[PDB]
Design a protein around this ligand. Sequence first.
Ligand SMILES: *[C@@H]1O[C@H](CO)[C@@H](O[C@@H]2O[C@H](CO)[C@@H](O[C@@H]3O[C@H](CO)[C@@H](O)[C@H](O)[C@@H]3O)[C@H](O)[C@H]2NC(C)=O)[C@H](O)[C@H]1NC(C)=O
Ligand SMILES: *[C@@H]1O[C@H](CO)[C@@H](O)[C@H](O)[C@H]1NC(C)=O
Lengths: 348, 214, 231, 48, 107
Amino acid sequence: ISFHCYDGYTLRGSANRTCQVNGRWSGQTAICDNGAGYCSNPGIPIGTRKVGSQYRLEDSVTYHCSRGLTLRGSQRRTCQEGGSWSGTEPSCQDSFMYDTPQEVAEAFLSSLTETIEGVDAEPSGSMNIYLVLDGSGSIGASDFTGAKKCLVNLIEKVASYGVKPRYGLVTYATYPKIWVKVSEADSSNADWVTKQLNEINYEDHKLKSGTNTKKALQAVYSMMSWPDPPEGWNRTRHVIILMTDGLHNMGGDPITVIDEIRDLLYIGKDRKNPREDYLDVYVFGVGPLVNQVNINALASKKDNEQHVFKVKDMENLEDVFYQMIDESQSLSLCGMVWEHRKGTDYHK
Amino acid sequence: LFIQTDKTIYTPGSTVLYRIFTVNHKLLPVGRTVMVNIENPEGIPVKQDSLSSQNQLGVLPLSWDIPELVNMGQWKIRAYYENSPQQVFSTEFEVKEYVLPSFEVIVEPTEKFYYIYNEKGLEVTITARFLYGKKVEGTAFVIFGIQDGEQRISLPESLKRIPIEDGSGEVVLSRKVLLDGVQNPRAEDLVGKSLYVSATVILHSGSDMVQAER
Amino acid sequence: AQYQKDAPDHQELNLDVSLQLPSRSSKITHRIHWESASLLRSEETKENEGFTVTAEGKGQGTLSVVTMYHAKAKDQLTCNKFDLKVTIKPAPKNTMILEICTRYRGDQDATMSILDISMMTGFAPDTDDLKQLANGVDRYISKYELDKAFSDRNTLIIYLDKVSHSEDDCLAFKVHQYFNVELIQPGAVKVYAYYNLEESCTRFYHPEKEDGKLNKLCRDELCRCAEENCF
Amino acid sequence: DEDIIAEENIVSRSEFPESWLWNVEDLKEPPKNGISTKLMNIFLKDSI
Amino acid sequence: SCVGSLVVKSGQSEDRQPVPGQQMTLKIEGDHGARVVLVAVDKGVFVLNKKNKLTQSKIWDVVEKADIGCTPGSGKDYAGVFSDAGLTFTSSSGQQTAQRAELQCPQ
Ligand SMILES: *[C@@H]1O[C@H](CO)[C@@H](O[C@@H]2O[C@H](CO)[C@@H](O[C@@H]3O[C@H](CO)[C@@H](O)[C@H](O)[C@@H]3O)[C@H](O)[C@H]2NC(C)=O)[C@H](O)[C@H]1NC(C)=O
Ligand SMILES: *[C@@H]1O[C@H](CO)[C@@H](O)[C@H](O)[C@H]1NC(C)=O
């Protein structure tokens, strides 16, 4: 199927698109814009419906998916100052679309590495990575062990950049189980964290195979919290990565915790200083049955970035991460400007 | 300069698609610089640009986005060559909240005028058919009135309710009610004045209602 | 002759107006010139803050700030120039009586009006009673609507010649239940003049549900449809 | 019931524009009798 | 009428009427190398407003209502026939046409 724009309108995005075997359209979304607004036309991803034609500043739009389809990304986007829509581009998902291991690893890293190149400004040890693994009986030992191996190579992949972040390892079921705490003197020791990632097993949560994700995120909360104003709090990037099927049945809505976390990090609580770049949440669907609606509600929504992933075969991610380790590629440093206290010109 | 707009009336929130044709004093394509303004109903410019039909073959595709919170009324698209600010071309388009009807209504009198001493009166035909050709089944409310100057005088006595069978109707204005509409004994004083018809068809389903006028 | 060259048409028109909003990081700078004068330059803000404006340069301009919102004026209760009262009662299948009273809010006996009625799903007007009202003075019902039978007369239009602004011109007719089914949909009645459609009044009738409304849990201004099973 | 089409396999209409076909066409076809002719294959909307 | 020509007929072999969501051919007979800008409008729109429609008749209307000539023919003299028609006759013998200052015709 091909797209064409009326007169006076410019076409950006794939003009021709082909229906592929993965139940997805090839190329990028077609958008017919006139470039007459503060922000450009967000466009209408195939399968969705946009409600909002005004693209002024402070204006907004809303997206809805057809019946039987699940919306991935943001359902509402607001035109922010500086010409840039909030959240991320929506996408109508079905019940068999999945994601190829490469696609996942490719997008997960193109979003992670960037939020690390900036971390170099400059133990230690100025980024935290909370690994929350789901050990519920609804995942099975197969899709669980494959999730660890994937994490292992991820830690090595990160390490290949020569960066030493603080790690926090937690597996959860009916109750949360903390293996590594960022406050530990060994959290920044990649090898340390890896040895733990190996000692854990799927049989660890067999006696009480609940799925209380809420308490799991509460475990992470207590790790980033304070006993009541550490000197280095408004300079630390927090990254939460959790594997789950999104099928929680104990504790209620886990999202409430995410909000509490954002309140703790003073995020989205200042018009002039959003501080969104200080918290990223990645959610990987692992179990046989995965609720794309719930894992999308936890994952972050950042423009041009993907935080929700539904691994097809899994285990292949592990082999992809290992293949994507390249010590030759350097870590960028261009166009970097951080709000330092003194802020003398030439710092800006 | 000739300005073309896709529609004749737009709803708040839609976009106006218009084109400017740049021809010389011989009606031929030419590359020129054109100024374009957009005046609100009260005649105040809200947007102005400076385009050029250069390398465009005397055709300037354009568009204007109508705000959700816009002013209802007759908007205006004014334009002119940069080397002739005095000679200004313009085209109007109406902005209003509405919904497209399902059928049209036509009111054609037997004659394109009216003879004063015509005892028969003014016979008017009421043709109403759906947009897809089919004929309308419903009722019609037709009324008359007199217009002399920029001022109209309704004739409450000339109210009729004729049925619309097979997409057709028939109503007549008795000469009695006409002369009785005014009060002036003379009938030659009506000479020069004009009459107007106001029809209203309504389907038996009561789902749609169209208003016409001649 | 020299004075005819050094003679200006107007005075300098070069305003550098900049408005800074607290909810915004950068200033909004505009420049008004003689040629570009009388130009509507608006900046919208979905947020209600106290912003400041700074003007600078040679000339003169006009500033105007107007906010648009929805006021809780109501009040109305916008039934307009009509007072429609509809009631559905049993009978002495399950025949019922539909009494429809109507009045006009004005100084004149409202001209020709319309009566759009929608039956309850599974109910149809008594043909006999319709004929009686059709023949009645100041009442007319299209012949097309008469000879329909219980086949499909779920929508009826009873045109009127007038409705007194004094008392209520109440009328009624029987409605038999030709088709039985659980959960029936409330009917409705709408009145209005032949010239103005907007100004009108509509009411709903239902055997059980009061004033023909659907069950919905309301609170302040947030309501949720409660038309489902119990547990 | 037993017959008719499933109320799920019914693809409802939706595209009801008040105006469309705002495109451009050039006549470069082999000119015969000074009358070039193009044959456009357009898709009608859902509107009746 | 049009200096050249432009026709828009159906490409279909007559047949019956189209169906919502169907392909139909659109034959266009115009001048060579000419650019054709199109536009489709629901007739339900003209029911509310049929004014300001661009028509060829309206085009010539503007062209004709701009002639430099006023009088339908002839004048009060020789130098008048020219000015009234839209011409300025001038010779070396002395006979010249009247002076024209106003852009638009008198009255
Ligand atoms: C979307 O699809 C269309 C259809 O292919 C693309 O337009 C096409 O552009 C190609 C490249 O010029 C043309 O290919 C031609 O194929 C014929 C076959 O005999 C050959 O003789 C020519 O030498 C040429 O290779 C093709 O004619 C043209 N299609 C048209 C004009 O109908 C278009 O580029 C695509 N949009 C994208 C992906 O940007
Ligand atoms: C903490 O970091 C924020 C980053 O926005 C900075 O603005 C602030 O000045 C810092 N606090 C202090 C006390 O300097």
